């Protein structure tokens, strides 16, 4: 019932460069008095959608001039003249000609910027947590690009093989960077079997691997 298709599902764009996304409809979106109800929404990481374009080529005050929209019938295009840091997120097209309302799959605008070295920190288990029976050591990687980074847990120079979890944030809306959190979790027993806990980090912005570490005591 009116299917929407978007042509680049993922779009890596360097800053200051243009970008274009295509929307294709299974039917004509022209309605009544010649209005073509095609909309373009933006959805930044962790936010609600925001309308950029209405009626194919309309743009509200507040939506930047670098956003434009065109096309006709069953073939439309959203263009950003010069991509900026806040343009990061997923863009959707939505028809309003018929019911039900239908969206595209969304285009993920992956923003590309200069290489950034991560800020590597580490946190020892809390005192409140140790009284519970488990111990969690946290390795923190702050604001780095590209997204690819390796975190390795070392317990007295022994490479760990399966006692940690990992998580990466979405791309930052200001510096186009990433952040990563690793959590090594053991029993209070296994925590008290060793002395030195370290996280070794490998990233393109580091000439040599940065090893953060703390020893019990």
């Amino acid at each position: 019932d009116i299917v929407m298709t978007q042509s680049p599902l993922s779009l890596p764009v360097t800053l200051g460069q243009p970008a274009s996304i295509s929307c294709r409809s299974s039917q004509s979106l022209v309605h009544n008095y010649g209005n073509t109800y095609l909309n373009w929404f933006q959805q930044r990481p962790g936010q609600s959608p925001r309308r950029l374009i209405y009626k194919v080529s309309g743009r509200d005050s507040g939506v930047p001039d670098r956003f434009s929209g065109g096309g006709s019938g069953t073939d439309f295009t959203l263009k950003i003249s010069s991509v900026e840091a806040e343009d990061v997120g997923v863009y959707y097209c939505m028809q309003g000609t018929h019911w039900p309302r239908t969206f595209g799959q969304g285009t993920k605008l992956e923003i590309n910027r200069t290489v950034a070295a991560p800020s590597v920190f580490i946190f020892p288990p809390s005192d409140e947590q140790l009284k519970s029976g488990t111990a969690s050591v946290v390795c923190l990687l702050n604001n780095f690009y590209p997204r690819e980074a390796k975190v390795q847990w070392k317990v007295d120079n022994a490479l760990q093989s399966g006692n940690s979890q990992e998580s990466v944030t979405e791309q930052d809306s200001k510096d186009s960077t990433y952040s990563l959190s690793s959590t090594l979790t053991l029993s209070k027993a296994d925590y008290e079997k060793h002395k030195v806990y370290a996280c070794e980090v490998t990233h393109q912005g580091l000439s040599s691997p940065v090893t953060k570490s703390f020893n019990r005591g």
Binding site: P49, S126, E128, S167, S181
Partner: protein, 222 residues
């Protein structure tokens, strides 16, 4: 100013019902009707339906026609979804759609709510434990220190975390949650502050897990 403030994150068991709220302000329902949609994480948006918040006349998509009910009271619009199933777990949104007395509903959405997470699970809910991530000499960089809060062992998602009652938002990174082998989630929120301030300023993590009605204010000292 236009605001669409939705209710808190909910968790129901399969077969039960969920009722989501959307409180509107800054406009009138005379010329603005309310749409309800939803978004599964991996999926795109699915359109649920619309209501005229004046006469409470509804229009549902056939996918939800049998088990959805949109209502209104005052300036609050409700969306009830019955006979819940596992694939009904998604973030539900309300959205504004302007109305012209000639040509009717404009085919667009201008303002959205912040959305509410709804998860369908038979498992019992569990509040989170909150442990400090204390700023150390191993936490200091270019004269900057990093501190945080570790939110562990909760179910289900989500947990919202603020710092100093919303007085601190700069440098905050609340990481996506991770599923443990226990079947419980765990995430870590951190913030970078001046190291010179570790003895003058107070840093509190405010943790809220509405599915369990759990509120934890943890103080992080160096």
């Amino acid at each position: 100013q236009v605001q669409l403030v939705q209710s808190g994150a909910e968790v129901k068991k399969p077969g039960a019902s969920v009722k989501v709220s959307c409180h509107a302000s800054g406009f009138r329902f005379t010329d603005h009707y309310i749409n309800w949609l939803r978004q599964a994480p991996g999926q795109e948006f699915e359109w649920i339906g619309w209501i005229n918040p004046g006469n409470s006349v509804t229009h549902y998509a056939q996918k939800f026609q049998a088990r959805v009910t949109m209502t209104r009271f005052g300036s609050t619009i409700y969306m009830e979804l019955n006979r819940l199933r596992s694939d009904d777990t998604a973030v539900y949104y309300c959205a504004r759609e302007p109305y012209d007395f000639h040509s009717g509903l404009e085919g667009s959405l201008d303002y959205w709510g912040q959305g509410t997470l709804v998860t369908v699970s038979g498992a019992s809910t569990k509040g989170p434990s909150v442990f400090p991530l204390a700023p150390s000499s191993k936490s200091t960089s270019g004269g900057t220190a990093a501190l945080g809060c570790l939110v562990k062992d909760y179910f289900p998602e989500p947990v919202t975390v603020s710092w100093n009652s919303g007085a601190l938002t700069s440098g905050v990174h609340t990481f996506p949650a991770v599923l443990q082998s226990s079947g419980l989630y765990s995430l870590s929120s951190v913030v970078t502050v001046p190291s010179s301030s570790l003895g003058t300023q107070t840093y509190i993590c405010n943790v809220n897990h509405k599915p369990s009605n759990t509120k934890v204010d943890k103080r992080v000292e160096p």
